[PDB]
Inverse folding.
């Protein structure tokens, strides 16, 4: 007997106030009971469960299930009730590595640890909660009652406690072997290194040597799966990586669940397939929760899908990470609020790709979206590589300086350089900071009756130019914008405009270059055509000439 | 320090479960080294998966030093931690601190590591050093002693501190010492020369009665802190535009001050005149303007600090490195206003400047009222939350919300 270290037990509790489960054991057929007794007898021999007396008041139902060509019977303990009453745990396995953050490893071994999984003892004081009962034949004797000594399959805490137990055991080996990497997930242990295969097969031996200190038997993963590894949806190849094949289903009838799955795949694909677009397709599922509901595809959605198919024709691959090289991110504007990016260290060899879609909103502009894309890529890069990439942006240095120095909010983009790849992001208008000498001054106003929705919009100027337009089905806010629109329409290339509309100022001072409001869009188009616009605000109803005059003209 | 102090959360509240945000490799490496030493010294211990709580951690560099400091963001735990009345019903905030000619700020948070933390409360201090690219499980720790940044640390330590200060306080009856979180504020009215040494005299005190950053001193001169009343232009020729802007400013001010009038000034704007046309001031308008100027000299009325309400701080970007701000509890009743310029270190970085403004404003609020304000920041949430930790140099963290619509009133503090 070679003494083996015990695996430290994790203390476990039920949620405060809650007690253990008390679920009735279903009736089983004689055949299923015999099967369960055999399985459980073997499991007891191995130490996994132990017979208990009748004092234990808890119970979880057990089932017997059958398979296709393995005419066996398999056991099943339905811990659904016990899981509801078990404390929460730290789940250490939320995110997975992204392949583009990994470094090449000459050699990779995969060990199997499903057997070591059962060496992990269950906290003694908690075992009572795992009790279950095998009913007796014909119900004529007491049922055989058992409880678990090890982490039950399907119990809430088994994944976290197993992973934590393995990491702790592996800790010393990894720290004293800086020339190898060890990754665990489920019953698989992945060991990689840049050592020659013989000298790497010895590290593996030493790892078994180490694992046996806790009596952990671990041989090579049976049926060593040839490259690539099918892991978490990727094809990890020795020199490259990819998503597993992306095949877009052909269809004449497209349904809610089809377009959801279609975006799913397209989204998954967009991390290596550059230029993927999903706005129009995503757009079609605006507010439907019946996944069987069929939806016609807008001609802009068919064009987008067919665009995706073309990108999906030939498989694309990424390269792994080299920390001695620079990290670079390049962004392109795709239109309709959509943005695409590549991250690379050498030209034409992407680590990964991605996309960004603009946030919901009434008004927006290209620079704000580009800024948001940059922040998204920044944060994704800190996760994957632990550092910010250098950016290549389709915006002139001079455009950015004008934008941020004049924008009412604080804003910042990290180290970047211009890349002259159209379309370029630009500022489409810039309001004057001071009134324009020699430019006509338009005093604008509008108003609407809340009952009838009839309104008026118009202006009076210092040259005696005047206009009032009657309007139907309108509101105060719309008439206030309509008035500004009329002044832009009817003025020369330079114009001073005086409004009392705090609503209109709030929109225009946000510097939109595009709107979901056709009327705001029309104002933007007019601003683009002007040479100079000074927009002045005054408070309503204060006797401010011009303002007072036009307020009267429009307040019918 | 033998006996721990019984600590609990507030009724019907669990511990924090706050996501760790991503950290650069250089901050992870710094935290690994720091926590390895803290673990050797017994200040923190590894924890198992039966602990589900979490508080974010990052690393900073204190002003004017090169060594990384661990900073835990205990904001969630602090608001879930029971309100504290350590030994007395409350230490009254010293209204005299804000009047001292010089106030130096000391990081005394390291003194907390000498007091054990109630063993039942430790689990709520859990935190994670994350790995890069999720390549290994984050390193999980909890505190065994009073942590820096936690509400309860000064409260629990307040007995131990009052004694360390007694001989110094007994000797210097006119020096004012105020403790906030990890910081000690020490104000004197004597020239900086002896002030600096007197500060060193207090360090040696804490050094004999006992630090990685205790050596530093953040110097303040709140007697020289300047407010910003409302000012109207003095001009010899007023254009239509000038008068329109003046009427707009006075109309805004009339919500703050009684008796502001714009009738006579508006009277000048009769007709529909060119914005650049010069308008001579009548006598009735000049008098009205003079009366408004006078009203604006006097302070606002009935402005009192209500200690049961939050302090709100609003900030405006004025451009060219200048920032204005107002602190208040109810709208239009400012308790403090201010203006900053030439934030050193970022003439080309808005966000760095705003982060420094937030820290300076928070420092002023601690001095004047003993608590931090809730900020209304002129910045998009995603930009702020990507970058502020890169420029943060304080050991506390206030709360903040984001302004997405441009306030029209930026112009009237311009
Ligand atoms: C070891 C491991 C395996 C899997 C899987 N499934 C997933 C992760 C996250 C793993 O964990 C780490 N993986 C790496 N790099 C990669 C680089 C690319 N390859 C694929 C490959 C290489 C060699 C052969 S080969 N010639 O032996 O047939 C076949 C396949 C695997 C290793 N780096 C780290 C750093 C810390 S953890 C970790
Ligand atoms: Mg009106």
């Amino acid at each position: 007997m070679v003494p083996i270290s015990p695996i430290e037990t994790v203390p476990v509790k039920l949620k405060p106030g809650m007690d253990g489960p008390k679920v009735k054991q279903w009736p089983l057929t004689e055949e299923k009971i015999k099967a369960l007794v055999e399985i459980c007898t073997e499991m007891e021999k191995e130490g996994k469960i132990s017979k208990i007396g009748p004092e234990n008041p808890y119970n979880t139902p057990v089932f017997a299930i059958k398979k296709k060509d393995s005419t066996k019977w398999r056991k099943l303990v339905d811990f659904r009730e016990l899981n509801k009453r078990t404390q929460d745990f730290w789940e250490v396995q939320l995110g997975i590595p992204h392949p583009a953050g990994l470094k090449k490893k000459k050699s990779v071994t995969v060990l199997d640890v499903g057997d070591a999984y059962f060496s992990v003892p269950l906290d003694e004081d908690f075992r009572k909660y795992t009790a279950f009962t095998i009913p007796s034949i014909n119900n004529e004797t007491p049922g055989i009652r058992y409880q678990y000594n090890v982490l039950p399959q399907g119990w809430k805490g088994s994944p976290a406690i197993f992973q934590s137990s393995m990491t702790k055991i592996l800790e010393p080996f990894a720290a004293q072997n800086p020339d190898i990497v060890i990754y665990q997930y489920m019953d698989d242990l992945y060991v990689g290194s840049d050592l020659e295969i013989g000298q790497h097969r010895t590290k593996i031996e030493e790892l078994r040597q180490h694992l046996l200190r806790w009596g952990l038997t671990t041989p090579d993963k049976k049926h060593q799966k040839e490259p690539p590894f099918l892991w978490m949806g990727y094809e990890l190849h020795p020199d490259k990586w990819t998503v597993q094949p992306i095949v877009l289903p052909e269809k004449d009838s497209w349904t809610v669940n089809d377009i959801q799955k279609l975006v799913g795949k397209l989204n998954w694909a967009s991390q290596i397939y550059p230029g993927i677009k999903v706005r129009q397709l995503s757009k079609l599922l605006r507010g439907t929760k019946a996944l069987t509901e069929v939806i016609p595809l807008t001609e802009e959605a068919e064009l987008e899908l067919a665009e995706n198919r073309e990108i999906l024709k030939e498989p694309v691959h990424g390269v792994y990470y080299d920390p001695s090289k620079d990290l670079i991110a390049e962004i392109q504007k795709q239109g309709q609020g959509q943005w695409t990016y590549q991250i690379y260290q050498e030209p034409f060899k992407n680590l990964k790709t991605g996309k960004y879609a603009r946030m919901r909103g009434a008004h927006t502009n290209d620079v704000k979206q580009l800024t948001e894309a940059v922040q998204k890529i920044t944060t994704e890069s800190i996760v994957i590589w632990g550092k910010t990439p250098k950016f290549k942006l389709p915006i002139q240095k001079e455009t950015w300086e004008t934008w941020w120095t004049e924008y009412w909010q604080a804003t910042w983009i990290p180290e970047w350089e211009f890349v002259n790849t159209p379309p370029l992001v630009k500022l489409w208008y810039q309001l004057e900071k001071e009134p324009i000498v020699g430019a006509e001054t338009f005093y604008v106003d509008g108003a609407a009756n809340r009952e009838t929705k009839l309104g008026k919009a118009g202006y009076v100027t210092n040259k005696g130019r005047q206009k009032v337009v009657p309007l139907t089905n309108t509101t105060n806010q719309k008439t206030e914008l309509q008035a500004i629109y009329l002044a832009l329409q009817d003025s020369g290339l330079e114009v001073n405009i005086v409004t009392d509309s705090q609503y209109a100022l709030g929109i225009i001072q946000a510097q939109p270059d595009k709107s979901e409001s056709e009327l705001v869009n029309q104002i933007i188009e007019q601003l683009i055509k002007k040479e100079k616009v000074y927009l002045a605000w005054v408070p309503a109803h204060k006797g401010i000439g011009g303002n007072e005059q036009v307020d009267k003209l429009v307040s019918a | 320090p033998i006996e721990t102090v019984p600590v609990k959360l507030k009724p019907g509240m669990d511990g924090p479960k706050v996501k760790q945000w991503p950290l650069t490799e250089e901050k992870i490496k710094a935290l690994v080294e720091i926590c390895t030493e803290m673990e050797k010294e017994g200040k923190i211990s590894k924890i198992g998966p039966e602990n589900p709580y979490n508080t974010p951690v990052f690393a900073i560099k204190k002003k004017d030093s090169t060594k990384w400091r661990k900073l835990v963001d205990f904001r969630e735990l602090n608001k879930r931690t029971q309100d504290f009345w350590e030994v007395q019903l409350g230490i009254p905030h010293p209204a005299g601190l804000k009047k001292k000619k010089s106030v130096t700020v000391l990081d005394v948070g390291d003194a907390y590591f000498s007091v054990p933390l109630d063993e039942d409360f430790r689990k709520y201090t859990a935190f994670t050093i994350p790995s890069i690219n999720n390549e290994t499980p984050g390193i999980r720790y909890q505190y065994n002693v009073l942590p820096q940044g936690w509400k309860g640390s000064p409260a629990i330590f307040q007995s131990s501190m009052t004694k360390i200060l007694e001989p110094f306080k007994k000797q210097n009856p006119d020096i004012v010492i105020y403790q906030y979180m990890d910081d000690l504020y020490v104000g004197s009215d004597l020239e900086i020369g002896q002030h600096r040494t007197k500060i060193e005299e207090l360090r040696q005190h804490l050094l004999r009665w006992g630090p990685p950053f205790l050596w530093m001193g953040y110097e303040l001169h709140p007697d020289k802190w300047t407010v910003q009343p409302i000012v109207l232009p003095e001009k010899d020729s007023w254009t239509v535009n000038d008068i329109q802007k003046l009427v707009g400013k006075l109309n805004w001010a009339s919500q703050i001050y009684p008796g502001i009038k714009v009738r006579q000034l508006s009277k000048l704007l009769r007709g529909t005149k060119a914005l650049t046309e010069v308008i001579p001031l009548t006598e009735e308008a000049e008098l009205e303007l003079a009366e408004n100027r006078e009203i604006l000299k006097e302070p606002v009325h009935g402005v009192y600090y209500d200690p049961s309400k939050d302090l709100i701080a609003e900030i405006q970007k004025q451009g060219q490195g200048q920032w204005t701000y107002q602190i208040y509890q109810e709208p239009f009743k400012n308790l403090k206003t201010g203006k900053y310029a030439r934030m050193r270190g970022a003439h080309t970085n808005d966000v760095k400047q705003l982060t420094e403004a937030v820290q300076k404003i928070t420092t002023e609020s601690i001095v004047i009222w003993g608590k931090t304000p809730k900020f209304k920041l002129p910045i998009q949430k995603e930009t702020w939350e990507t970058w502020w930790t890169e420029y943060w140099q304080a050991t506390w963290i206030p709360e903040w919300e984001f302004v997405n619509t441009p306030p029209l009133v930026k112009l009237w503090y311009q």
The CA atoms of residues 146 and 262 of chain B lie 59 Å apart.
